[PDB]
Design a protein around this nucleic acid. Structure first.
Ligand SMILES: [Mn+2]
Ligand SMILES: [Mn+2]
Ligand SMILES: [Mn+2]
Ligand SMILES: [Mn+2]
Ligand SMILES: [Mn+2]
Lengths: 238, 236
DNA sequence: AAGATATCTT
DNA sequence: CAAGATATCT
């Protein structure tokens, strides 16, 4: 499928190529930094050509937000099925030591999930799937000078791993951020995201949970986690 | 000076080079995107070796944050006087052809000496802003021989180095993330320092006492004139 | 002015 | 974990 081919292409590109710098049209290269702000951007730009190639191979149109601050990073759709759009979002996180547990922030829970056209390229109800291409990397004089046309240039990361999974599948029950009201993913090992070991039973449960999750702990008398939500649901949503 | 040599070096590097992609050790090039989140990152990495070069020429050690989410991008200090550090922070904004920058939070290091800062705030004697302004303009890969044909995600870029206080405005630059907003002016005003604050003392005091929401501010002050009136009322 | 867009630190 | 930080934009 488009999906099996997408993840295959991503997993494969990550194996065969290592980003190591920014290059100008004149051939001068500037090294990269080791913080997530830099790597998330690098990993996303590294993903863009692959995502588009595969989509074109499957007859899908690819569209990126025309305006900034609009989810998702990529919208894939066939003209023939305008209401079956697929949102693909690239997310990145780090770890100081490989194999440790990781967590991702999975977008806000007060924008498009609560409002059909809020901060999304197309209305939420036109997408039938929301995929997450998650990247994980172990943080790592040389990075201070410029280089000319590779191999010597030090790479600010170690053991980059990539996965593709449904957002609802890896969604957790605890916020991924406070003042920016983000859904938090499960806090588990990379293998757990690949195998889809989340906490919701269905996409509808994930949606209902985040659509009724309160903004601050002061959730006290509603629900703060999946167990409480199920009890809340059992009682009649009150 | 270090400042004049840095400003010059910045201008020259900007005139001489156009970043056009990310390159792998294998020679394959991925193009750049056209949003601030991407450009801010590129403009900053572009700034690093030059800031480091001039610092070396002047005998300053350069330190970047070891920890994420800590101001500033670059901490410079001479090995003899460690208590007189210079903070250099890169900021970026776009133009579809008057501009404004967010200038960092007003509830972190300026209210607490050790909050979100690499070194105590009181060890810094200067806070410089290297501002990049770009006019907003592929999904294919390229090789070295195709450098000149890689589409740039910007039509033109202008860079400036000014003191933070000098370009600071009086309205926030963000709400839930409580950032100071710069003045809303033309690129030339940032270069020439046509601010609103009478002094860095006034800038600091204004942002250290700016309330987070309009409700709170409406009892104190929402702009420069009101803060001045608040001062006269005895800071009450 | 308030709150979105992406992640991380305390 | 929560809350609030990191950078910008809508
Ligand atoms: Mn994007
Ligand atoms: Mn993304
Ligand atoms: Mn962890
Ligand atoms: Mn919109
Ligand atoms: Mn700290």
């Amino acid at each position: 499928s488009l999906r099996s081919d997408l993840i295959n292409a991503l997993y494969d590109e990550n194996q065969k190529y290592d980003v190591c710098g920014i290059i100008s049209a004149e051939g001068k290269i500037y090294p990269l930094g080791s913080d997530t702000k830099v790597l998330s951007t690098i990993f996303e730009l590294f993903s863009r050509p692959i995502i588009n190639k595969i989509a074109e191979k499957h007859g899908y149109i690819v569209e990126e937000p025309k305006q900034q601050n609009h989810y998702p990073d990529f919208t894939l759709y066939k003209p023939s099925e305008p209401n079956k759009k697929i949102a693909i979002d690239i997310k990145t996180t780090y770890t100081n030591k490989e194999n440790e547990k990781i967590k991702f922030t999975l977008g806000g829970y007060t924008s498009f999930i609560r409002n059909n056209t809020k901060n999304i390229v197309y209305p939420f109800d036109q997408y039938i799937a929301h995929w997450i291409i998650g990247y994980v990397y172990t943080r790592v004089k040389s990075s201070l000078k410029t280089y000319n046309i590779l191999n010597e240039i030090p790479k600010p990361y170690k053991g980059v791993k990539v996965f593709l999974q449904d957002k609802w599948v890896i969604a957790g029950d605890l916020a991924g951020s406070g003042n920016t009201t983000n859904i938090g993913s499960i806090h588990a090992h990379y293998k757990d995201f690949v195998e889809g070991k989340g906490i919701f039973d269905s996409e509808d449960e994930f949606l209902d949970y985040w659509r009724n999750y309160e903004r601050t702990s002061q959730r006290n008398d509603k629900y703060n986690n999946i167990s409480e939500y199920r009890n809340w649901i059992y009682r009649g949503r009150k």
